[model samples]
Target chain A: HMERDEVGAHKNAVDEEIERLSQPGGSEDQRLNALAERFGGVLLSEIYDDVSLEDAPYFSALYGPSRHAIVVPDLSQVTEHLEGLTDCPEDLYLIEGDPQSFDDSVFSVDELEKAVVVKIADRQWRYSRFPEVPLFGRAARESRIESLHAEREVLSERFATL
Target chain B: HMERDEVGAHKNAVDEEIERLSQPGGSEDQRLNALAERFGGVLLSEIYDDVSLEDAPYFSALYGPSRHAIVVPDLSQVTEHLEGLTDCPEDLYLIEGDPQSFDDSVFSVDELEKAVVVKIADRQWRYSRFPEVPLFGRAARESRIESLHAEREVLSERFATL
Candidate 1:
C-alpha cells in the first residue's frame, strides 16, 4: 500500500512538472530553440561524420526522408548551440527535417532494407520470444515489404533516368 | 534427440510448403489474388459499419496518410482478391518529409513530431534502468524519468507551434 502511494506521488509530481513546463512564455520557446540548435549540431557533427557545415545547404537539397540530405541550415552553428543543452535530444531528426528541402543523399533503399533485415533478424535471434510481430516473416510479409522496396527503386531509377 | 528430430521435420515441412508455393508456372499469385478479393468483400460488406465502399477512398484520404490518396480501383473485386492471400498485410505509415515517394503514407510535421516524441519517451522509459545505472538511486532515476517527460512536453509544444 505504501509502495503504491509512492508511485502515485511520483506520477503526480511528474505531471505537475510537465504542466509547469508547458506554460506559455519566452523560456519555453528558448529551451526548444536551444534544443533544436543542439540537435542540429549533433546530427551535423557526430552522426553525419563526413559532411561539413558549409556543405549543409548542398546536402539538404540532395538528401531527405528519402535521401541523404538533412533539413538544417548553418550546421556548425546549430551544433555549437546544441552543445549547451542536454547531452542528447530525444528526436533530433524532427528538427533537422523541419527546415530542409530536397534530399538526394547516396544512401540507397537497398541498403536500408538490408540494414533493417539484419538488425531485426539479429534481435529475433537473440530474443526469440520477442512479442512484436516480425516485419518480414512469411511470403506475404516479404511481398509486402518488397513492394515498398520496388516502389522506392522505381522512384530512384526515375531520378537517374532524368 | 526425438524432440530435435521433430523440430527438424517441422522446419522441413515449412521449406517444402514454401517451395511448393513458389514454384514456377504455379498459380500462387492467382490464388493469392483471389484471397485478396474475398477479404476485400468482407471489409466492404460489414466491417466499416454504415460507411459505403465509395466512402473508403475519401475516408482514407482524410484520416489516413495525408500526402497520398488511395483509391481502390474496384472495391468488390479487390476484397475478393484479398481472400486468397496466405498472410495478413499490416499498415505502416511514414512522416510527410520522406523524400521517397514510395513510403506507405506521409504524416504532417506536427503529427510526425508527436510520433517521434512518443517513441523516444517510450524508449527512455523502457531502457533507463535506475538501479542499473551507476551513482543513481531510486529517487534520482524517478526524477530523471520525470525530467524526460518535461523535456518531451517542451519538444511537443515546439513542434505544435507555427
Candidate 2:
C-alpha cells in the first residue's frame, strides 16, 4: 500500500506536468504581438498562417531558418530609436522585408512531400518532427513534455513487466 | 508476493511470446522459391532489390498490391500441368510478364518524394511507416511483433501512471 501511494503520486505528478505543458498561456503571444507593433512590423506567423495542417512539420522545415524570424518592413522607423540598444536578444530575430510580398507556396503539403533533405543535429530528417524549433516558446513546454513522455513510456513498460 | 508472481510470470510469458514472434523460421522462403521454380519464374524481389533502405514503406506503397505478387516469365510452360489444379492458393499471387523488362526507376528515393497519395484504412500517412505491407512473409513476424510492441508500450504507460 505504501509503495502504491508513492508510485501513484508520482504518476499523478507526471500527468499534471504533461497536461500543463500541453497548453501554454497565451500572454506570450501578446508580448510578441506588442513587440511587432513597437517595431512597425508583423510576425512571420501573423502574415502567413501555416499551410499544411497535418504536415506542418514539413512546411516548418521547408521555410528553413526563417521559420521563426519576425518580419520587419519599416526598420527605418526603429533604427534611430533602437540604435541605443546594448545587447542582442537571445532567441529573437528580426528580418527586413515586406512580409506581405514573401511567397507562401513553400508551406503547401505538396511542397512538404517534395522537400529537400535537411540536416539537423548531424542526423537526417525531412522536416517531419521538429515542431519545437519553428513555433518557439508557443509550445516550448513540448521539449520537457517529450522527455516526460519518454519517461512515462519507460515507466509504463516497467509496470507491464512487473 | 502472490500477485507479483502471477504478474511476473505473465510478463515473462509475454516476453517469451514476443521474442518468438520476432524471429520466424525461414522455411516460408523455401516454399515461395519452390513455387517460383515450378513456374520457371522469378520473384519480383529477385528482379529488383528494394531501392530505399529507409523509405521502403513508400516504395511498397507505390508498387500497390503487386508488392507481394510473384513474377512468372513463362505461363505457357505451366499451362499443361496447372490446368488440373482445383483451388487457388490463399495469399499467393502470380503475375505474367518479364520482370527484368519492367522499369526499376519507380523504386527510387526521388520517386518516394514524388509519391502519389495512397490510402490505407482511410487514414493519411506518407509511406513513412508501412514496412509490413511490402516484402511479404520475409519479415511477416513483424505483424505480431508490432502488436506486442504496441501492447508493451501500453503496459509501460500503465505502469508509469500506476
Candidate 3:
C-alpha cells in the first residue's frame, strides 16, 4: 500500500509548485495545462450542459460520484431545487461568467449556506449537493412534458412576433 | 418565468404516483423506460466510461455540469486523494458496485467526511474532484514521461512473469 504520508507529501509538493506558478506574473495557465495533460484531467466546461439533476445518481454510479464537477446555468434554479435539502454540502466554489455583471449584494449571505461563490469569467459554477433522483414513471414523463410545453410556447411566441 | 412552487407541486405529485406504483408489484422499469423515452433521458452506464476525469471540465461545459454522472474504476485511489480536503462537500452520495466486495470497514468514517457513502449495486463510484489542469510546455511533457516510466516497469514485470 502506498504510504498516506508519502502520497500527501508528493501531492503537496505538486500543489505548491502549481500555486507558485499561478501567482501574478507567473505562468498559471501554462502550468495548469501541463498538469492536466500529465494526469489526463478534463475541464469542467466541456460537459456541463449535458447532465441534469435527475441524471446525477446514474452518472455518479458510472463516473465515481465525486469525479465530475457540477455546473448549473442559473444559480437561482439550483438553490430553489435545494430548498428542502437538510444535508446541503458546504464550501462549494461558484464560478460566474462575468465577474463585473453579477451583483453579489442581491443574494442573501446564507443563500449558498457557507459556499464560496466566485466570479471566474472563464470558469463555470457547480452545485454543491446532488439533486434528488426523480422517480421513474408517468409522473417523471409528465414533468418533462411540462418543460417541453413551456419551451414550445416560447418558440411559438417568438415566431408569431417575427 | 416558471413558478418554482408550481413545478415543485407537480414534481411532488409525480413522486407520489411513482411511490405508489413501486410499493408492491408495479412495473416500475417499464414505466421508467416509457418516461425516459418521452423526456430523452439517457442511462448512466451508457456514457460513464466514455468521459475521463481529465475530460470532465470540457464535458461538463457541453452537457451542463450536473448532466453526466462520473464513474471511477477504483474507489480507494479516490478516497486517498480526498484525505486532506478541508473544505470537502457534504451529503455527497458514494455509490458502490458490490457491498460485500467493498471493504468499507477499512476506511475511517471521517474519510468520507460529510459525504454519504452508500453501496449501490446498480451504480458505480467516482473520484472526488477535478484533476489540476496541466501547463503547456516541456515541463508538462516531462511529467508525462515520468508516469510512462512507471507504466513501463509494470508492463515489463508482467512480461517477465509470463
Candidate 4:
C-alpha cells in the first residue's frame, strides 16, 4: 500500500501543476491544445470552435488516453434519468444539485481531461468561455452546491482512513 | 506525482492514434472529395457497407462509421440519442452492460469503429462469428469471470469508474 503522505504529496504536485497550466493566458485555444498535446490528454468535444459556451449548456464524460480521467456530467440533466433507474451504482450515478448557474456559468471539472460544458434554455456554457460563462440554472445549481457540501461532510467523516 | 506503478497503464496506444486520425478526418469530410480520400478517418454520420469488427470500436467512435459488431438484443440496445452522444474528447465510449435473463453476454470497449448494432439472440457469439477479430465484448467475458467470484460487485465497481 502507498503511504498517505506520499499520496498527499503526489496529489498536491498534480493540483499545483494543473493550477499553473490552467490559468488564463496566451491564446486560449492554443493553451488548451498545448495541454492536450503535452500530456497526451484529450480535449472534450464541442469545447472547440463552432460550439460556443455562449450558445448552450454542455457537459461530457471523458476517459483519456491513459483512462485515468473519469468525468460524469453535472447531475442537473441526468437527475431524472438517475432517479428513475434501478440497480444504479451510487458513486457512478450523479444526481446531486450542482452550484454553478447559467449566468454564473462557472463550471470546473475535478480535472480538465473531462472538462464541463453546459447548455440552458438552449444556450451553451463552457469553461473555455471563462469569465463570461454563465452558471447553471437556479434550482439545479443550488441543489448541486448543497449536495457537494454534503459530500464534503461524508469525506470528512472518512478522513481517518485517508 | 503518481508513481509509475501506482497509476494504471491504460494501454491505449491504438485509441490515441485513432483519435488523432479522427480529428483530421472531420476536417477532411468537409473538404472537396478529391482531398477527402487522403484523410483516413470517418464521420459520425457517414455510413459504410458490411461493417465489421475489423473497423474496431475506437475507429467507429471517431468517425461514426458502422461496424459488423452487434449488441445482443436479448441483453439490450443502446439508444439512438446515446449513440449520437458517444463522441468524446479522446477515446470512444464503448458501453458494455450485463447479459439479461438467461443469456451470457459481456460488455467491452475494444470493438472498432461502426454503428453500435444490437446483437440478435440467435446470432452466434461475437467471438465465434468474427473469430480473430478484436472485440470490446471480450472485456465483458473477463468481467463475467470476475463477477462469478464476487457477484456483480466487480463489474459494478468497474462501471463506477466509467
Candidate 5:
C-alpha cells in the first residue's frame, strides 16, 4: 500500500512538473507547455501516466528528451507553435492527437502488460519496452524496455518473499 | 526506369487484388475488402506503397497476415463490421486513422527507408523489420526491421557491383 502511495506521489510530481513547465515562466526560459497550450498539446509524460513510474535512469534513456515531447492537435499547428516561440524548447518532438485516444486496443491493440498499446487512426500500433528509436540510434542502448520490465519483475518477486 | 515501372505494376497488382477481394467473391470466402468498405478502411498493404517491394518471405512474416488488416477511420466501426459479417474474418486488426497521415514524420515521422513509419496520434510511432507482436510472441523473431534494412543494403551493394 505504501508503495502505491509512492507511485501516486511520483505521478503527482510529474503532473506538477507538467503544470510547472506549462507556466508562463519557469526555471528555464523555454517552456514545453507552450506547444501544449497553443495546439491542445500535452506532454508525452502527461499522456501515459504509468510510464513515468519507470526507473529514472532507464526512463531517461528510454525517452530521453522526447519525454518532454508536446502532444499537439494537428501537426500543422506544431509549426505555428514553433514559429510562435521565442526560445525553442530544445527542439522537443510533437504529437498530433489526444494521447488517451490510443490507450485500449480492443477496437483496434498489444500485450496485456509490459507494453504500451494504442490505436492510431485505422491501425492498432503496439510498442514494447525496447521501442524503435528513430529519433536516435538503437545500436548501443544495451537494454530493451521489455527487458527492464522483466528485470523489475524478478527483483520485485524476490523482494516480496526472500 | 525499369525498376520504377516494375514498382508501378506491383502497386497496381495490390490495388487490383483489393478490387479482386471485394468483388463479392475471391480465392476464399473471406474477403478482406469487406472491412475496408464497411468502415471507410483500407488494407495495410494499400496503405504503404513502398513496403510491398520488401523480400517476400520476410514481408510475409514481418506483417504476417496484418498486411491485409483493414484500415478504418474509427475503431468502433470494426465491431459493427464484425457483427455484420455472417462468417468472421479470422480476427484481423483495425487501424483507426488515415494511414497516409503518418507517412511523413513531418507534422510527426521515422527513418527514411526499411521502416514503416506512421503517425499514431501525437507521438510518432516507428516500427522496423522486427516489430512487436502482441498477437503472438517476439522472443524468436531474431530480426529487427532495422537489421533487415541493413542486410538488404549489404546484398544490394553486392548486386550492384558484382
Candidate 6:
C-alpha cells in the first residue's frame, strides 16, 4: 500500500512539473532548460541552414518528437555552433541540418554513426538512418541517388517518345 | 507547351480515377483490383494472426500510409488467407505480429526478409524495419527487446528504492 502511494506521488509530481513548464509566457530556452534538467537530456539549437522561419510545420515534424530539445535557426551556422559540443550526451543530442552536411571537422565519425539525418526539400524530405555504416551506408545512399536518376530518365524518355 | 498540356490531361485522368474508386458501396476486392490495375502495386490483406479489431489505430497507422493498398480483415484470419499467395510482390509487404510469431512453417525465410512487422500493444508498440539483414537484423531486435526490459527494470528499481 505504501509503495503504491509513493509511486502515485512521484507520478503526480512529474505531471505537475510538466504542466508548470507548459504554461504561457515561458521562453523557449527556459522551458527547454527545465525539461532537460528534469529528463537528463541535452539541448542543441540554432543549427539549420537556409530553411525559412515560415517552414515551422516541416521543422516541427522533423525535430519536435525528439527525446532532446532542438532549435533550428532560419540561417545556417553549423560550424561555429557545433564546435562548442566537446562531449556529446550519451543518450540524446539534438542537431539541426543534414548529418551529411557535417564531416570529421565538426563531429566524430562515431557521432555520425550514432545519428539519424533528415534532409529537407521544398515539399518532401529524405531520411538516412545511419550514414556511417561501412558498405551498407554507401549502398543505401547510392541506391537512393540511382532511384532518383532513374525516375528522371524515365520522365525524359516518355517525353521523347511523346 | 503541348507536352505540358498532355501531361496535365494525364494527371487529371489519374485524379478522377482515384476519386471514383474512393467512394462508398464498392467491395474491398473491387477497390483493390481497380487500384492495382491503375497503379501497378500489389495488395496484401488478412495476414495478421489474432490482433484485436479494437486495435484499429495501431493497424491503420501501419497500413494506412503505404504506397500500395493494404486490407485488414475485420476478423483475424492469418494462415488460411495468406496461403493463396504463391508469390509475394517485388516492392514491400506489411505484416502485423511480432517477428517471433513468423517461422519457416508460416512463411519462407525470403518472405520474412521482405516483410515489415509491427507488434502492437495498448500503450506501446515495436517495429522491425528489415527482418532480412543477417547480423544487423538480429542486433536490431535484440537491442529493442533489451531496451524495453531495461526500462521495466529501472521502473521496478525506482519503486523499490522509494
Residue-by-residue lDDT tens digits, candidate 6, A43-91: 4332223234233223322332232333232113322233322222211
| lDDT of candidate 5 over B20-137, digit per residue (tens) | 3233210222566664676677765555534322343234333423444666666654554443233333234555567677432122333322333334343443222222122122
Residues B66-93 of candidate 4: C-alpha lDDT, one tens digit per residue: 1211222211132222233323222222
CAPRI grade, predicted model 1: incorrect
The collision pairs in model 6 are: none
Q: Which residue pairs collide in model 2, if any?
A: A156-B156, A156-B157, A157-B156
Give lDDT tens digits, candidate 6, residues B22-113. 33321133444443333332343322323332332233323322312333221124223323232222111223323333321121111112
Candidate 5 ranges with C-alpha deviation above 4 Å: A1-162, B1-30, B52-60, B103-162
Better of 3 and 4 by DockQ: 3
Candidate 4, residues A1-162, lDDT tens digits: the string is 456556555555544544433334222233334433332333332122223333322322211121111122332333333232222111121112211211111332222322432221111111122221222122343344455555545544444478
Q: Where's the lowest-lDDT run of ten residues in candidate 4 chain B?
A: B120-129
CAPRI class of candidate 4: incorrect
Residue B120 lDDT, candidate 6, scale 0-100? 19
Chain A TM-score for each of the predictions: 0.24, 0.43, 0.18, 0.23, 0.39, 0.21
For candidate 1, give fnat to 2 decimals. Answer: 0.00
Q: Which 10 successive residues of model 1 chain B have the least lDDT summed? A: B122-131
DockQ (model 4, Cα): 0.02
Best DockQ among the predictions, by candidate number: 5
Instruction: Write one digit per residue (lDDT tens) for candidate 5, span A1-162.
Output: 777555555545544544432333101124656646766766655454443223332343234234456665566545543442333321345555666773321223332222223343333632223222222222222234444445545545544553
DockQ of each: 0.01, 0.01, 0.03, 0.02, 0.06, 0.01
Where model 1 places Cα greater than 4 Å from the true spot, the runs are A1-70, A87-91, A94-100, A111-162, B1-162
TM-score of chain B of each: 0.18, 0.43, 0.18, 0.15, 0.39, 0.20
True contacts kept of each: 0.00, 0.00, 0.04, 0.02, 0.13, 0.00
Model 1's DockQ score = 0.01
Off by over 4 Å in 3: A1-162, B1-40, B43-49, B61-65, B68-162
Q: In model 4, which regions exceed 4 Å deviation?
A: A1-20, A23-162, B1-91, B95-162
Query: Residue B127, candidate 1: how far off, in angstroms?
Result: 18
